[PDB]
C-alpha cells in the first residue's frame, strides 16, 4: 500500500531517535548498581525487571521510522545473546554510541562509507586485541571456576557443570531439568542437537529463554516441502487423539501449512512446532534418517513413493523432550532401540573408513559424534521447590557462560575489557581522514558500557574510565565494591565470545544505519 | 530593557542565517557575469546595481539575532574596502564559506577555539604564500598598466597616474578634481595629507566614495578638546558670513559640540567637518603647527591664554580643497606664504641634525616629507560634464588601485590567487585534529570567490577550480573570455594588498563568530 | 529599517506580476480602436482616458516587489516619450513581451547574461534595419505632410509648422502659445534654448507638460554656486515688490538656498525657479554672458569681485516668457538690444576665425547658432477658448512629431516597422544557443504592438501579423480601415526616432530585469 | 562496453554535432545527451567525489577510457574489469527514453477520488 518515504538527515534522525529510546530504556539495567524497569501487563501486576533483554522485547514505537530504527538494532543485538548466551544489552549500548557519533560525523559532511570502513577496521583490531587479553579456560578446574562465578559464587554449580562436561566432553550436549531430590543427578541419555531453528517466532511456549519446549512430543520426519495442510490432516488428527504435541522436520514448511500451524497452535488445537531438516541433498536425507533411528520413527519420502496422507502414528518418532531455539533444535532421550542406534553408529563408522573425500569424512564424523555422544542431563537438587527452580535457572545461565568460556576464554567483565582493548589501538589509522574518524568513533564507543555501569552506580564515568585506561591487562573498576584491581581475580568477567559478539553485532547494525540514505514504510 | 538571550546552537544558527542573507545578496554581483541587485527607494524609481558595497549597505534583517550576524560580518568586511580600496564583497563571501563550514564542525563537537587557531594558521600561511606570488609594480610601465586596467582599459588614465607619480614620487600625495575643460592638467601645489578620520559620518556630502569634500574652506586649528559649542558660536557664525565652509582640527571633538555640529551642518547651514589633530602628545602639537604654517592660519592653544571666543576670521587658514576619508584627511593648496612654509621646513630639517635618536630623525623627516613633498593634482577633462564626472570616477578608482599595487604588489585576479595559494598549503598542520579541520575549512573557503564567479558565468565551478588548482603560478581562468592562462598577461589582477586584506578580515570576523557562545539583544 | 529580501525565481515572478499589471493597464489604449481606462479622482467624477502615459502615471502597487517591477519599466519607458515625444506605451508593451518570454527562458535554465546579449544584438540589428527602412523627411512639403498626419489630418497645422521650420531652420527653436484669436501668427524673436533642467520639482506650475512656465520674469545671472539664501534677500525682495517671477541661473543652487527657494515659492510668495548655467568649465562663463547679452542682463561674478547683495533690478535680465523642462530651458523674447546681441555675435564669429582646433570651432558655432537664430513663436488662432487650447495642444504634439520626423525620418506605423524589421533578421545568430534564444525572444517581442493594436480592434492578431510578415517594405495593416497596403501612402507612420527609442528602452529595462537576481525592499 | 556509467557518457560525447529538423528538436537532442551523464554522475556522488569533474575528465578521453569509482583510478574500463553487456546499456537507454517521451507528451491524467 501507499508508502511514506524519507531520505538523508531527515531519515537518519528518525532512526537515531528510535534506537535512542531502545537503548536508553535498556541500559538503565546495566551492571550491579543497575536500576529497575517496569513493564506493564494487561492482566495482573506489572513486571519489575532488571533483565534488559526482557525490556528490549517490549519496545515498539509509534513513529514508523523511529520504530524501524529500534527494531533494526533490536534484531541485530539479539544475535549476540543467541551466539554467546549473553551480550545483547551491551551490544545495544555500543550500537547507540557508534550510531550517535557516527551520524554526528555524517552530518558534519564526512563520507559514510569511509566512516563505516574505519569503524570496521577498529573492530577487527579490537577483536584481535581481545584474543590477546583472553585467559584460556581449558582444564576443568577452570571450567568449574567460571561456572561458579556465573552461578553467583555457588561452587556446586561449577562442580556440576564440570562433571557433566567430563561425561560428554566440552563439545557435548548438556541440559538442565528439575531434580528428583535434595541431591543433584547427572545422567547421559540417547539424544541429539543440531542446527534447525523454529520456522516461526511463535511456537514459543517458554518466552523467557526464547525457547520452544515440548514434553513427550511426537516427531514427524519427512523429506519434502510442505506447503499445504491437506497432506498433513490425517497425521495431525492422529496426533490430536493421542493428546501429545508434535514436532515437524522437513525440507521446509511454507505458506498455507505454516500459517495454519501458527494459527492452530495459537488456538490450542494440537500444539505443533516446525523446523528445517539440517543440510541439503543426500546429507539432509542421511541426517533425517539418523534422527529417525534415534527416535524410533520412520522417514516419509516421495522418492520411495511414500505419502504424508498414508502416514500413521507408528511412523512418528518420540522423545521425552525437545527444545527449539532461534537457531537450534535439541532432542532429549529418544525412544529408539539401542541395538538400532548402535548398529547405525556402526554403519556410519564404517562408511568413514570407506570415505574417499575429506568433506565426506568430516560430515560423517559430525553425524556419529551427534549419534553416539548423546545428551547429558543435569537434574538439580534443592530443599524447596523455589530453591530448586532458582538453582536450576542459575545453572542454565552458568551453562551458557561456561560453554562460551570453553570456546573463546574469559576477559575482564564490567566493560573494562572493551575500554582496555580500545586503549591499545590509539595509534591505529585508516586510508583517509574520514576513515580515521570512523576509527576514533568506534574507539570512544567501546567506553560506553563501563561508563553506563559507573553512572548507574552514581560515580563519575569520566574519571573511572580515565583510571581504568591508565592501567594494564585486567586492571579495572569493580563497581560492586567501588574498588579497583584485577577483574579476573575479583571474579568479574565475561566470556571473550560475548564481548566479541556484542562489539561485532553492534558495529554491524551501526555501520548499516550510518550508510542508510532512504527509509520506506507504510502510512500512519 | 528586557532582553532576549540565545545560547550555543540556537545563537549560531541565527547568526548563520543572518550572514547567509548578507552574502547571498551581495555575492550575485561577483565577477564579469555578475547579476543585478535591485534596491528599492522610498521616493521614486528603484536602484539597479552590481555594486556589492551598495547592496550590503541596505541589508538589515527583521530577526534581531540574524541581524546581529549580518551586521557583524558587514562591519568587519567594510574594513577591506577601507584599507586597500577594494575587496569588501570578497571578504563577505569568504566569511560565509568559513562560517558555514566552521559552524558545521562545531555542531559535530569539535572545539571552536581550536578551529579558530587552525583557521588563523591557514590565513598566516596563505598571506606568506601570497607575498611569494606577488609580482612587483615599480617602474612606470607597470604602474601605467595597473592604472589602465583599473580604469577599464583606458590607457590615458594609466599614463596619467604614472605621470603624476613621476612628478611627486611613489610616496607622493595625489588628488583628482573636476576639469577646466577638454584634455587634461597635471599640477604640483603646496599641501599635506595626514591621518585623521572624520569624527562623525553624516558629514559626508559625497556618499559614493564615502568622503567629506569641502571647497575653499576656512581651516580652524585648535589644540584642546572641545566639549561645548558655546565656545564655537563666534567662529561658526563668523564663517556663516563669508559664505565659506569650515574644517575643525582639535585634540578631539566630543559630546554636545559634536552632536550640535552634526545637526547644525546637517540642516544645510555652515557646512563643517571635524577631525582629530594628527598624532598624540607633543608631536601632535608639532603637527598642528606645521599645518598652521601651511594654511596661513594660526593655532589656538590654551597655554598662551587665547580663547575660542576671541578668534576672528584672519586667525583661520584657508585652502582651495579639503578631502576627508574614513581614516585620512588631505588638504590642498593653502594660502600660507612660501616664506612661512620654507621657513618651517628649514626649522624642522635643522631639528633633524641635532637628533640623538633614530626615532626623532625619522619622525621629523616624516614631517618634512608631508610638508615639503607637496601635492600632485590631476584635473580630468572631457567633452561634457557627464563624461568628465565618469572619467574622474574611473581615475579615482585606478588611482587607489595603483597605490595599493605599488605598496604590496599584484597577484592573479578573478580569485585565482586565493585558490592557488590554498593549493600550496595542503600539508599545513596544527597541534591537534580540530585545528587541522580549522585549516582545511579555511583553505576550502578560499575557493569560494572563484567558484562564485564561475557560477555566475554559467559554467561548472568545481571543474574550473580543479583545472586552476592543477596549474602553477598566476595561471588561472579568465572568466570573461572563458580562456585559461597567465592572469597577469591577460590583465586580470588584484593588488595583493586587497586580496590579503580580504582574507584577513573575513577570517577575523569568522573566527569571532565561530567562538561566540551567547547573544544578547533587546526583546521583539 | 529591516528589509525583505527576495531571490532568484521569487524575485523574478514578483517583478513580472508587477510589469504585467502596468502594461496590461496601459496597452488597452493602443492604436485607433484603443479602449478606455477610468482613473478615479478623490473628489467628483473620474477621468476617462485613452492616454497610456496617464494610465502609467497612476500605476502603483501594494506588493513592494511587484511595485518595484512596475516602477522600473515605467521609469525606463518614460524616457522614450521624453526623447521622441512618443513611444512610451509602446516601450511598455515591448518590455512586457521581452520580459515575459525572457524570464520563461531564464527559468528553463538558460544564462540570463547570454539571453541579455542575444536580445541586445537583435535590437542593434533591428535598429540598423529600421534606419534602412526609414523614408527621409526633409523638404517642407514633407514636413507639412507629417505635421498634418500628426494633427489628425489638419492641413492647417502642417502648413504652420512648415512655415516655422522655414523661419528658424529645421534645427531651430519653435514655441507655440495662445493666440490673439481667429488668426495664426508666426513671429521670430530674440531668444535661446539650452540644456539646463529645473533644479527641483515643485517649481512646476504646469503639471500637464511637466514644465515650469514664467511670464515677464526677471533673469538673474551669476557665476558661482549659491548654497546660502543670505546673499539673495535684497534681490529676492526687490523682485518681490516688482510683482514679477524670477529665474536663477548660477553654477548651481544647493542646500539651504535651494530648499528655501522651494518652500518660499511653494507658499505663493514671489515665484522663483533655478537651473544650472549651461555647459561646464571655462565655456560656462562665455555662454552665461551670451544669455546675459540676449536678455539685456548683467552677469554677477566673484571673479571681478561682484556680490549678489549689491545687485539691483537693472542688472537683471528680462524676457517675455521662459519655459523649463526636466532637461531644457527656453528663453523667449529677451529684451537685450539688437545692437548688443549682434555685436556679441560678431565677436564670437571672429573668435571662430582665431580658433586653433575643430572642437573650439564647433562649440563656438553652437553658441552663435543659439544666439543669432532666435526663437520662432506660433500664436494659435481659434474662434472660442476651448478650440484654442485644443488646437494649441494638437500643434504642440504635431511639432514634437515633426521634430523627430526631421531628425531621423519616418517608418511605417501601426507597429508594422517593428515586425517588418524583425522579419528581415530571421537569420541572425549569437555565440551560443542561449544567445540565439535571446535573439528570437526579442524578434518575437517586436510583434507585440501590432498584435495588441489588432486585438483592440476585435481582430485576430496572429492572422494580421502573419500576413504583414509575408509582405515587403512598408506594406502593413491599416487598423482604422481594416485594410492592407503601403502604410506610408495610407498616411500611417511613426517618426523613426520614436520606434527606435521605444525598442531600445524596452530592451534596456528588460535586459536588466532578466539579469536581476536579488531584490531588497522595506517591510510592510 | 565500459561499465560504471562511462559507455553512456562516451557515446554522448560523440553526438555533439547532431541536429534535428527544428530548434525544439535540437533542445530535445541536447536533453537526452545531458541525461546520458546522470548514471556516472550519481555513481561518483555516492562516492563523495565531484561528479562534474569526473564526468568532464571522462569526456576528455576516448573509447573505453573512464573512471573506476571503486579504486578512484582512471584508465581503460574493460582492462580494469568494469563493464556492462552492451544489450543492457542500450536497453536501459531505450526504455528510459520511451517512458520519458510518453510522459513529456502526456497532457491529461485521470484517477480515482480520495
UniProtKB/Swiss-Prot annotation, chains A, B, C:
During the substrate-folding cycle, the two GroEL rings separate for effective substrate binding and chaperonin activity. Ring separation is triggered by ATP binding to the trans ring of the asymmetric GroEL:GroES complex and avoids formation of functionally impaired symmetric GroEL:GroES2 complexes. Activity of the GroEL-GroES chaperonin complex requires Mg-ATP. UMPylation of the chaperone by SelO/YdiU negatively regulates its activity, and may facilitate survival under stress conditions. Pfam families: Cpn60_TCP1 (PF00118). InterPro entries: Chaperonin_Cpn60_CS, Cpn60/GroEL, Cpn60/GroEL/TCP-1, GroEL-like_apical_dom_sf, GROEL-like_equatorial_sf, TCP-1-like_intermed_sf. GO terms for biological process: chaperone cofactor-dependent protein refolding; protein folding; protein refolding; response to heat; response to radiation; virion assembly. It catalyses: ATP + H2O + a folded polypeptide = ADP + phosphate + an unfolded polypeptide. The modification N6-succinyllysine is found at residues 33, 50, 116, 276, 320, 389. GO terms for cellular component: cytosol; GroEL-GroES complex; membrane. PANTHER family: 60 KDA HEAT SHOCK PROTEIN, MITOCHONDRIAL. Belongs to the chaperonin (HSP60) family. Each subunit is composed of an apical domain that binds non-folded proteins and GroES, an intermediate domain and an equatorial domain that binds ATP and is involved in inter-ring interactions. Forms a large central channel that appears to traverse the entire length of the cylinder with no obstruction. The central channel of GroEL functions as two cavities, one in each ring, that are separated from each other by the crystallographically disordered 23-amino-acid C-terminal segments of the seven subunits. The entry and exit of polypeptide seem to be restricted to the apical end of each ring. This is Chaperonin GroEL. It comes from Escherichia coli (strain K12).
Amino acid at each position: 500500500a501507499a508508502k511514506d518515504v524519507k531520505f538523508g538527515n531527515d531519515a537518519r534522525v528518525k532512526m537515531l531517535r528510535g534506537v535512542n529510546v531502545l537503548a536508553d530504556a535498556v541500559k538503565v539495567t546495566l551492571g550491579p548498581k543497575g536500576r529497575n524497569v517496569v513493564l506493564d501487563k494487561s492482566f495482573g501486576a506489572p513486571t519489575i525487571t532488571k533483565d534488559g533483554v526482557s525490556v528490549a522485547r517490549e519496545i515498539e514505537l509509534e513513529d514508523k521510522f523511529e520504530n524501524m530504527g529500534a527494531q533494526m538494532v533490536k534484531e541485530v543485538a539479539s544475535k549476540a545473546n543467541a551466539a554467546a548466551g549473553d551480550g545483547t544489552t551491551t551490544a545495544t549500548v555500543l550500537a547507540q554510541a557508534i550510531i550517535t557519533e557516527g551520524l554526528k560525523a555524517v552530518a558534519a559532511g564526512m563520507n559514510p562509507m569511509d566512516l563505516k570502513r574505519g569503524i570496521d577496521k577498529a573492530v577487527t583490531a579490537a577483536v584481535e586485541e581481545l584474543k590477546a587479553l583472553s585467559v584460556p579456560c581449558s582444564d576443568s578446574k577452570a571450567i568449574a571456576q567460571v561456572g561458579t562465578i556465573s552461578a553467583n559464587s555457588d561452587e556446586t554449580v561449577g562442580k556440576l557443570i564440570a562433571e557433566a562436561m567430563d561425561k560428554v566432553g566440552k563439545e557435548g550436549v548438556i541440559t538442565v531439568e528439575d531434580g528428583t531430590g535434595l541431591q543433584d543427578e547427572l545422567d547421559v541419555v540417547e539424544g541429539m542437537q543440531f542446527d534447525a531453528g523454529y520456522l516461526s517466532p511463535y511456537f514459543i511456549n517458554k518466552p523467557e529463554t526464547g525457547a520452544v519446549e515440548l514434553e513427550s512430543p511426537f516427531i514427524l520426519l519427512a523429506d519434502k516441502k510442505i506447503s499445504n495442510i491437506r497432506e498433513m490432516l490425517p497425521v495431525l488428527e492422529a496426533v490430536a487423539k493421542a493428546g501429545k504435541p508434535l514436532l515437524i522436520i522437513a525440507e521446509d514448511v511454507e505458506g498455507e501449512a505454516l500459517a495454519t500451524l501458527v494459527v492452530n497452535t495459537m488456538r490450542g488445537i494440537v500444539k505443533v512446532a516446525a523446523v528445517k531438516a539440517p543440510g541439503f541433498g543426500d546429507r539432509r536425507k542421511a541426517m533425517l534418517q539418523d534422527i529417525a533411528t534415534l527416535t524410533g520413527g520412520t522417514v516419509i519420502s516421495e522418492e520411495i513413493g511414500m505419502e504424508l496422507e498414508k502416514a500413521t502414528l507408528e511412523d512418528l518418532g518420540q522423545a521425552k523432550r525437545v527444545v527449539i531455539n532461534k537457531d537450534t533444535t535439541t532432542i532429549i532421550d529418544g525412544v529408539g532401540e539401542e541395538a538400532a542406534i548402535q548398529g547405525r553408529v556402526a554403519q556410519i563408522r564404517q562408511q568413514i573408513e570407506e570415505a574417499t573425500s575429506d568433506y565426506d569424512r568430516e560430515k560423517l564424523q559430525e553425524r556419529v559424534a551427534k549419534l553416539a555422544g548423546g545428551v547429558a542431563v543435569i537434574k538439580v537438587g534443592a530443599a524447596t521447590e523455589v530453591e530448586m527452580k532458582e538453582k536450576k535457572a542459575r545453572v542454565e545461565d552458568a551453562l551458557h557462560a561456561t560453554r562460551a568460556a570453553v570456546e573463546e576464554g574469559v576477559v575482564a567483565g564490567g566493560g573494562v575489557a572493551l575500554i582496555r582493548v580500545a586503549s591499545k589501538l590509539a595509534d591505529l589509522r585508516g586510508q583517509n581522514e574520514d576513515q580515521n574518524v570512523g576509527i576514533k568513533v568506534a574507539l570512544r564507543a567501546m567506553e560506553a558500557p563501563l561508563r553506563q555501569i559507573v553512572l548507574n552506580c552514581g560515580e563519575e564515568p569520566s574519571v573511572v574510565a580515565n583510571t581504568v585506561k591508565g592501567g594494564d591487562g585486567n586492571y579495572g573498576y569493580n563497581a560492586a565494591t567501588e574498588e579497583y584491581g584485577n577483574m579476573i581475580d575479583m571474579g568479574i568477567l565475561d566470556p571473550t565470545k560475548v564481548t566479541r559478539s556484542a562489539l561485532q553485532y553492534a558495529a554491524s547494525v551501526a555501520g548499516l544505519m550510518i550508510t542508510t540514505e532512504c527509509m520506506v514504510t507504510d502510512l500512519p
